Amino acid sequence: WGSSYVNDFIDRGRVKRVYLQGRPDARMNPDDLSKWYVRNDKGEMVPFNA
Amino acid sequence: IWMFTRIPTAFLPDEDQGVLFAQVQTPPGSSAERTQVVVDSMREYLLEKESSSVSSVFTVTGFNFAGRGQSSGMAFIMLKPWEERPGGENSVFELAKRAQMHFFSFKDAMVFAFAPPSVLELGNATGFDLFLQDQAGVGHEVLLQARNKFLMLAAQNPALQRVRPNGMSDEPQYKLEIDDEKASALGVSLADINSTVSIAWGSSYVNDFIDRGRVKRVYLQGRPDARMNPDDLSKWYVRNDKGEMVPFNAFATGKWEYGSPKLERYNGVPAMEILGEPAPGLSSGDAMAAVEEIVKQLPKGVGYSWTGLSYEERLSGSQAPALYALSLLVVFLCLAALYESWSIPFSVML
Amino acid sequence: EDGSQYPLEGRLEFSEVSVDEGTGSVTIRAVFPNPNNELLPGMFVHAQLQEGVKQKAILAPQQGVTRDLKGQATALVVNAQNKVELRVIKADRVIGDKWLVTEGLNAGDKIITEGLQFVQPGVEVKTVPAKNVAS
Amino acid sequence: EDGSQYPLEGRLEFSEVSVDEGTGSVTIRAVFPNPNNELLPGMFVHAQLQEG
Amino acid sequence: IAQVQVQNKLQLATPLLPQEVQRQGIRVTKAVKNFLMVVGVVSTDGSMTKEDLSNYIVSNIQDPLSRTKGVGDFQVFGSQYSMRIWLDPAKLNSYQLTPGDVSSAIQAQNVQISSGQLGGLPAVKGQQLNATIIGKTRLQTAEQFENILLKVNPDGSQVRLKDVADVGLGGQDYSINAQFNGSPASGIAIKLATGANALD
Amino acid sequence: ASAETVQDTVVQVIEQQMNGIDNLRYISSESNSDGSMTITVTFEQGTDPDIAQVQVQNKLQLATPLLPQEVQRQGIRVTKAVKNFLMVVGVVSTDGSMTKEDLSNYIVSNIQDPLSRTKGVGDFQVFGSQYSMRIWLDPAKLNSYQLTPG
Amino acid sequence: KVNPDGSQVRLKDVADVGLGGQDYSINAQFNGSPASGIAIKLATGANALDTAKAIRQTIANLEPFMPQGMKVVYPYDTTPVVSASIHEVVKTLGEAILLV
């Protein structure tokens, strides 16, 4: 949700940036925050609202 | 008025100053010892053949005024003091032209020799200097095509001499492509590949250490036997995730390309600059007129930009008639102030 | 591993026709006589093979052949009428200080190795034997 | 693996319909003649194949 | 002198900041509010948004008017392009991946690597060949970005960065949104350089 | 790094801000393949060089981390370099027993900063470098002991 | 790396460590013999002769601390042309005033 800026990349000689964020419809309502998953130490994907 | 417009223009007439500069550029891709074998030869030539005028030569390899790299090398020639070299044959200009005449025997490198101007703080060589700016945004190769056309056109003009590019010609390079798909499929990562290719060739500086009370650096690089040829690229190994070593040529290979080693820019727009001295006898202003009439014929889309002492000379030649006009105006006008009429200053200005 | 050569000499035989999945490499085997137990099992060594012998080879000096302009290797040679002309070649392997050119060069050809900065292809040029190699 | 083409075309027959959960991919299988043993088992290759 | 003093204080203060804001870069200016003028570029037919208009301003328009006489400084509404990568949570859940893995894979597979030279110094005695090595370079198009390998398996199966996410050139920031008579536009405010006539 | 790496990243991260400086005459940038770049901006006469140096100093910090952060470890050098050199020093003795490295080490270690703290010495350029503990790796024994340079 | 049975491998065999140079790009010769130098650029707005005398003094004070197998020369200098130029112009000033 915070648009992390990763590093830079070349575009037509100029040095632009590359950002990272989710899809728009993935972050619009509070229950959409339950749509994101995180891998535990054993390899399963825990949901967020757990 | 005819005698006035017949006189050629110049700026700061040349003085001896007892110094000389020389610079060599071996063909691109040549190693350092190939440049060493020509700088020591021209050094011993200046030492034994011109013992009348020089005092000592001090040469460096790796760096000159036109750039830096393995295919470059310069030499400062400090001459004898003045009364030890009497006569015009022992001046820096006569020695410069006769050493330049001898230097065409050196078929290996494109060695040039010149002198700095009368002031040392305005450049370090006489003659003109101009940039070939690409104002229309044309490609890089058409600019060096125009530069080569300009060089072959100025070589046959009997007004100029020692016309050289202050850059360097293009050079073959070695692209190293890495199939990351097969490399990752074999089990090895990519960050360790990047690290070992940046350490084994790139000579990574790791941290500091103390030596004799002084902080110094410590570097890391492969041995010189392991990085000399492209197949030595196959002599390096990376450890995969399973713990075994996989060679570098199992996933990577190479290719030959062609790129320029030194690139410059003038006022935000790319350019390559050309230097040159006028031929003996004539001035520098008619030499600039010659490069004007030879830069009229050029590929379209690029222009010339004056710089340095040539730019200063152009401004000094431009700002002169207003100086003359305001000067004789104020002397006429203060002379009418002191002599209380207009008629005798109007007669005495004549 | 110290760099010293083993005094005796051994032969080889092929014993593993399958390439390894992880390493991506094929292993072969050799037999060596060890009369004084100078070799121990587990020692790291460097074998030296023999992958054929080129009979009518040709070795160009590195000072005479250069790459150019998204292309292959080129070399300037003078013809019988002393006119310099460029020829493309396919040199890829480096032997010592020479290139092993496969095709595009023949024996008796006179390759330019000194004086490239003052010449373009198509110029009448006089010839002198150069001083760049030990020979 | 070196990008060179192979002279002899082969034949495809399907042998695995169970998509792996780790990468979302299925494995399909093909046969190839190998007369003079220029192919070895266990090397990375890129097989081109046909569709509509 | 006031600007360089404030900039020096901020410059020795900047290691106290976190990493993701000091990689953003602090911008210190002397601007008060006054401008010579402001000139806007408007997309009348609706073919462009604000972001590509500001990108055209940064790429094509920024250099010549900065090269003109009497122009001190300027500021632009909006900024240039960026490589936006929109992540999808469902396919990350399917491929058992977290966004930290995507960030680490991008940081591994989009770099510039100093790879030295063939006949670099100190060379062996008798070496006659020397050439720079062009190793890994940064990716340029979106298609080079979308083929980034996130995970592979030794049988050859792989997950790339083209199903689990959506790459494309977009804007660096989407907070500001301006338009000109309804039609979208982006502009630049230009001040006068100290010691210059205004009309010329 | 090569000349194409430093072509339009470090040059065109600076040269767009370098226009608009007071009484500017011209800007000239240059980049090499051995990994160096130099940008010389020059102004007309009459201006004192310290206010021009602090103007360039407050202008180039608009994009100081926008260049690659690894070369920031070396730092951007800002210098009022004039055009040329005044004098050079330093030599071997007649007895030999010195290479061309230990002389440069002794110059840059013992006599360099006492030379540079004297009056009027605005810049220096030393041929050679200091000592550094070079560690030459062998790839064969790295393959032997299952180690990487990392 | 060290295994727990006492076996070990150090940075003695896999590499060789030598107190070498930091950058092997540029190197200098004086009359054929190998040497090294440092060219000094004068500061903006500073006199040349007093600074050259200061350079000679700050060489002359610490030259006793140099080893026996070392020496210092001045391969390239520009102050004698300034001294000779001002000497020539005061000489032609004296000749001109006596001639007048």
Q: How close D2 gets to chain B, by Cα (Å)?
A: 9
DSSP string, B291-346: HHHHHSSS-TT-EEEE-HHHHHHHHHHHSHHHHHHHHHHHHHHHHHHHHS-SHHHH
Q: Domain containing E157: what range?
A: 83-171
Token pair listed for D30: 């093909």
Token pair listed for D43: 């090397």
Q: Is F81 on the interface with B (CB under 8 A)?
A: no
Which CATH number does the domain housing residue E123 bear? Answer: 3.30.2090.10
CA dist B288 → B154, B283, B313, E115 (Å):
12, 9, 10, 44
Report which residue type is found at C33: P
How far apart, in whole angstroms, are the C-alpha atoms of residue B146 and residue E166?
Answer: 45
List the single residue in D with minimal CA-CA distance to C16: D40
Cβ-based neighbour number of residue C99 at 10 Å: 24
Interface probe for F, chosen from G7, G10, G11, G40 (most Cβ of F below 10 Å), is G40
Alpha-carbon torsion angle B248, B254, B259, B262, nearest 10? 20
CA F108 to chain centroid: 15
Three-state secondary structure call for residue B258: strand
What are the chain E neighbours of A18 within 8 Å (beta carbons)? 82-85, 106, 110, 145
Token pair listed for E11: 């410059």
Residue entry with tokens 């070079």: F134
Alpha-carbon torsion angle C37, C40, C43, C47, nearest 10? 50
What are the chain C neighbours of E128 within 8 Å (beta carbons)? 61-63, 97
What are the chain F neighbours of A15 within 8 Å (beta carbons)? 8-9, 12-13, 66
Beta strands in F1-150 (DSSP E): 24-32, 37-43, 91-92, 121-126, 131-137
Contact B267, B181 (CB under 8 A): no
Burial class (CB in 10 A: 0-12, 13-18, 19+), F2: buried
Interface contact B258-C68, CB threshold 8 A: yes
How far apart, in whole angstroms, are the C-alpha atoms of residue E78 and residue E187?
Answer: 8
Q: Domain containing B176: what range?
A: 171-259
Contact B54, B78 (CB under 8 A): yes
Which one-letter DSSP state was computed for residue B88?
A: G
DSSP string, G25-67: S-EEEETTEEE--EEEEEPSS--SHHHHHHHHHHHHTTGGGS-
Resolution value, angstrom units:
3.2
Interface contact F89-G14, CB threshold 8 A: no
Three-state secondary structure call for residue B44: helix
CA dist B336 → B324, B350, E74 (Å):
18, 14, 53
Closest CA to F132 of D31, E40, B205, E186: B205
Report which residue type is found at B85: R
CA-based R_g, chain D, Å: 13
The per-residue b/e assignment along E172-186, b for 16 or more CB within 10 angstroms, e otherwise, is beeeeeeeeeeebbb
Nearest Cβ partner for C17 among D1, D40, D44: D40
How far apart, in whole angstroms, are the C-alpha atoms of residue C85 and residue G76?
Answer: 45
How far apart, in whole angstroms, are the C-alpha atoms of residue E192 and residue F20?
Answer: 9
How far apart, in whole angstroms, are the C-alpha atoms of residue C105 and residue F47?
Answer: 64
What are the chain G neighbours of B78 within 8 Å (beta carbons)? 75-77
How far apart, in whole angstroms, are the C-alpha atoms of residue F57 and residue C108?
Answer: 63
Contact E170, E75 (CB under 8 A): no
Closest CA to E28 of F57, F77, F15: F57
Closest CA to C61 of C112, C115, C125, C116: C112
Burial class (CB in 10 A: 0-12, 13-18, 19+), D3: exposed
Helix (H) or strand (E) holding B276: strand B273-278
Q: Is F5 on the interface with B (CB under 8 A)?
A: no
Which pairing describes strands E165-171 and E81-87: parallel, antiparallel, or unpaired? antiparallel
Contact F85, B122 (CB under 8 A): no
How far apart, in whole angstroms, are the C-alpha atoms of residue B273 and residue B286?
Answer: 20
Sheet bearing B204-211, strands edge to edge: B204-211, B214-222, F131-137, G15-21
- Give the angle subtended at the CA of A37 by the CAs of A33 and A41, to the nearest 5°: 140
Closest CA to F60 of F75, F70, F74: F75
Contact D28, E155 (CB under 8 A): no
Contact B261, B165 (CB under 8 A): no
Contact E85, E112 (CB under 8 A): no
DSSP string, E121-179: SSPPTT-----EEE------SHHHHTT-EEEE-TTS-EEETTTSEEEEEEES--S---E
Which pairing describes strands B160-165 and F37-43: parallel, antiparallel, or unpaired? unpaired
Cβ-based neighbour number of residue B279 at 10 Å: 15
Q: Is E157 on the interface with B (CB under 8 A)?
A: no
CA E63 to chain centroid: 17
Closest CA to B205 of B215, B192, B190, B191: B215
How far apart, in whole angstroms, are the C-alpha atoms of residue G56 and residue B26?
Answer: 37
- Give the angle subtended at the CA of C119 by the CAs of C118 and C121, to the nearest 5°: 165
List the single residue in G with minimal CA-CA distance to F94: G69
How far apart, in whole angstroms, are the C-alpha atoms of residue E141 and residue E139?
Answer: 6
CA dist F107 → C7, C125, E47, F114, G29 (Å):
49, 49, 65, 10, 15
Q: Is D38 on the interface with C (CB under 8 A)?
A: no
Contact E157, B181 (CB under 8 A): no
**Ramachandran class of B200: left when φ > 0, alpha when ψ lies in -120 to 50, beta otherwise:** alpha
Helix (H) or strand (E) holding B270: strand B269-271
What are the chain B neighbours of G29 within 8 Å (beta carbons)? 39-40, 43, 58-61
Burial class (CB in 10 A: 0-12, 13-18, 19+), B117: buried
How far apart, in whole angstroms, are the C-alpha atoms of residue B47 and residue B205?
Answer: 41
List the single residue in E with minimal CA-CA distance to F71: E114
How far apart, in whole angstroms, are the C-alpha atoms of residue B171 and residue B157?
Answer: 29
DSSP string, B223-248: -TTSSSSGGGGGG-EEE-TTS-EEEG
How far apart, in whole angstroms, are the C-alpha atoms of residue B312 and residue B121?
Answer: 13
Which one-letter DSSP state was computed for residue E5?
A: H
How far apart, in whole angstroms, are the C-alpha atoms of residue C135 and residue D9?
Answer: 52
Give chain B's contact residues with E (Cβ, < 8 Å): 29-34, 70-71, 171-176, 178, 180-181, 184-187, 189-191, 194, 197-198, 201-203, 224-225, 227-230, 257, 259, 261, 267-268
How far apart, in whole angstroms, are the C-alpha atoms of residue B317 and residue F112?
Answer: 44
The per-residue b/e assignment along E132-166, b for 16 or more CB within 10 angstroms, e otherwise, is bbbbbbbbeebeebbbbbbbbebebbbbbbeebbe
What are the chain B neighbours of G32 within 8 Å (beta carbons)? 40, 43-44, 47
Interface contact F144-C46, CB threshold 8 A: no
CA-based R_g, chain F, Å: 21
Token pair listed for B253: 């290979």
Burial class (CB in 10 A: 0-12, 13-18, 19+), C109: middle
Closest CA to B43 of B32, B60, B57: B57
Closest CA to E169 of E55, E92, E60, E75: E55
Token pair listed for B187: 């089990």
Distance spanning both ends of chain A, measured CA to CA: 19
- Spatial neighbors of A31 by CB under 8 A, at least 6 apart, are none
Could you tell me what percentage of chain B is helix, strand and coil, using 3-state DSSP and rounding each to the nearest 5? Answer: 35, 30, 35
Q: What are phi and psi of B192, to 5 degrees?
A: -75, -30
Closest CA to G76 of B116, F96, B33: B116
List the single residue in G with minimal CA-CA distance to F107: G37
Q: What are phi and psi of B235, to 5 degrees?
A: -90, 5
How far apart, in whole angstroms, are the C-alpha atoms of residue C63 and residue C88?
Answer: 15
Chains that touch F (3 or more CB pairs under 8 A): A, B, C, E, G
Three-state secondary structure call for residue F90: coil
How far apart, in whole angstroms, are the C-alpha atoms of residue F107 and residue G64?
Answer: 14
Q: Is G59 on the interface with F (CB under 8 A)?
A: yes
Interface contact D40-C20, CB threshold 8 A: no
Contact C125, C82 (CB under 8 A): yes
CA G36 to chain centroid: 7
How far apart, in whole angstroms, are the C-alpha atoms of residue B339 and residue B299?
Answer: 61
F38 pairs with which residues across the strands? F30
Report which residue type is found at F120: G
Burial class (CB in 10 A: 0-12, 13-18, 19+), B123: buried
Q: What are phi and psi of A17, to 5 degrees?
A: -120, 170
Contact D26, E157 (CB under 8 A): no
Q: Is E69 on the interface with A (CB under 8 A)?
A: no
Burial class (CB in 10 A: 0-12, 13-18, 19+), G6: exposed
Helical residues (DSSP H) of chain F, grouped into ranges:
49-60, 102-106, 112-116, 139-144
Which CATH number does the domain housing residue B188 bear? Answer: 3.30.2090.10
Q: How close B345 gets to chain F, by Cα (Å)?
A: 36
